[PDB]
Write a protein that binds this ligand. Structure first.
Ligand SMILES: [Zn+2]
Ligand SMILES: [Zn+2]
Length: 80
């Protein structure tokens, strides 16, 4: 039911894991601009619906932690 990064209701399977549409596009836009996200804190920001925008670094590390990857979407559009 819930996005694995930010805990809002999931929308589907994107880049291998169950996510909302918002984290789908964050991650898409992150790997396309290869952004230098750094965390001003101690890498322990809460990532939830209200706070996810506060620290793209910490939200980025969560997608990785939850196992998103560009490898999944490439292969899934080739299988199709
Ligand atoms: Zn999310
Ligand atoms: Zn942070």
């Amino acid at each position: 039911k819930l996005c694995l990064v930010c805990s809002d209701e999931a929308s589907g399977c994107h880049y291998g894991v169950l996510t909302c549409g918002s984290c789908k596009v964050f991650f898409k836009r992150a790997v396309e601009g290869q952004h230098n996200y750094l965390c001003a804190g101690r890498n322990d920001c809460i990532i939830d619906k209200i706070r996810r925008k506060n620290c793209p670094a910490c939200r980025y590390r969560k997608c990785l932690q939850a196992g998103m990857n560009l490898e999944a979407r490439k292969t899934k559009k080739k299988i199709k």
